[PDB]
Design a protein around this nucleic acid. Structure first.
Ligand SMILES: [Cl-]
Ligand SMILES: [Cl-]
Ligand SMILES: [Cl-]
Ligand SMILES: [Mg+2]
Ligand SMILES: [Mn+2]
Ligand code: NA
Length: 326
DNA sequence: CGGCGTACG
DNA sequence: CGTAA
DNA sequence: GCCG
């Protein structure tokens, strides 16, 4: 078992679901306290279990696995022996965990804002609605639409949204393409938003595209919320039988020269990409982002025509999107 | 012990 | 500060 | 919290 998530296939469904979910609770709780190192270790330990070929049944099977030390092993031991880990259950029922989770789930609210509200004594969404002076326009939209945004986005919703986005993109710039990214490209059947990556086969023609796309979607009445730019974090109006629902949609534009890097980055998972960028820099001395891959010694950028190119330039076996579910 | 991804709005 | 994978 |  290699130490970095980008070195091993991680399927969407696996054989250690309960164990990984418990470790991810502790990772999430660490993030709510600003403990980014412990968040990473618990996320990585969870991801290792996702990559295993069969269930962990005995504590000895953790021997030699990367990112399992005293603490993560004790969590697993307790789950194996008792079906529950006292620390995990204590986190789950804690007022701090439940409120930070509730607040950070709001679009426009991060850990720092949620924590300040928590310290001020706020605990519920109606507490926030009662004092709208302390809310940004973004947070107001996130709170108004919070119920719909808490409802899973289905693969059926995705096809309908993609046709609508393609219509606007085609008028904004004939020839431009729309690619489904994020968790749905990794094979997820549900999500909390839909991610699209837009480009054009003629380098440079994509400049200034996203404002033109957004204006057209807005004129169709499809935009419930949005803020020169190349990423848009929108709330869309999605038809439903006899009604509609709000759905988060992310639109991103990249020039075709960068498209493989943007596709790789926006396909995720989030942990997979952090691990890939960490691997690139620490193991290969190369600097990776969603625009390119930089050699800081030669001061040169690697040209890539495909995701396969990028895995090759990093010395990694190719993983299709369905095996990037770290 | 230092390090822990790297961008854009 | 928020957002993104 | 764990790795190197
Ligand atoms: Cl930490
Ligand atoms: Cl409607
Ligand atoms: Cl980036
Ligand atoms: Mg997504
Ligand atoms: Mn998204
Ligand atoms: Na949030």
């Amino acid at each position: 078992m290699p130490a970095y998530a980008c070195q091993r296939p991680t399927p969407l469904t696996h054989h250690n679901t309960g164990l990984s979910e418990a470790l991810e609770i502790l990772a999430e709780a660490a993030g709510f306290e600003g403990s980014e190192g412990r968040l990473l270790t618990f996320c990585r330990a969870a991801s290792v279990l996702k990559a295993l070929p069969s269930p962990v049944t005995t504590l000895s099977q953790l021997q030699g696995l990367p990112h399992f030390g005293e603490h993560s092993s004790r969590v697993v031991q307790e789950l194996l022996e008792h079906g529950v880990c006292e620390e995990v259950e204590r986190v789950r029922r804690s007022e701090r965990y439940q409120t930070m989770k509730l607040f950070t789930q709001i679009f426009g609210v991060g850990v720092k804002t949620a924590d300040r509200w928590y310290r001020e004594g706020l605990r519920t969404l109606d507490d926030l609605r009662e004092q709208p002076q302390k809310l940004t326009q973004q947070q107001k939209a996130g709170l108004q639409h919070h119920q719909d945004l808490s409802t899973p986005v289905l693969r059926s919703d995705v096809d309908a949204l993609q046709q609508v986005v393609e219509e606007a993109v085609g008028q904004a710039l004939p020839g431009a393409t729309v690619t489904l990214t994020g968790g749905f490209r990794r094979g997820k059947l549900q999500g909390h938003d839909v991610d699209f990556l837009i480009t054009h086969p003629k380098e440079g023609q994509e400049a200034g595209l996203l404002p033109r796309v957004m204006c057209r979607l807005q004129d169709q009445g499809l935009i419930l919320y949005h803020q020169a730019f190349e990423r848009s974090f929108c709330i869309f109006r999605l038809p439903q039988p006899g009604s509609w629902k709000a759905v988060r949609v992310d639109l991103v534009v990249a020039p075709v020269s960068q498209f493989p890097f943007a596709l790789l980055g926006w396909t995720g998972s989030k942990l997979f990409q952090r691990e890939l960028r960490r691997f690139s820099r620490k193991e290969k001395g190369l600097w990776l982002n969603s625009h390119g891959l930089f050699d800081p010694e030669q001061k040169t950028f690697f040209q890539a025509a495909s995701e396969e190119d990028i895995f090759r330039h990093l010395g990694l076996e190719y993983l299709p999107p369905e095996q990037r579910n770290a």
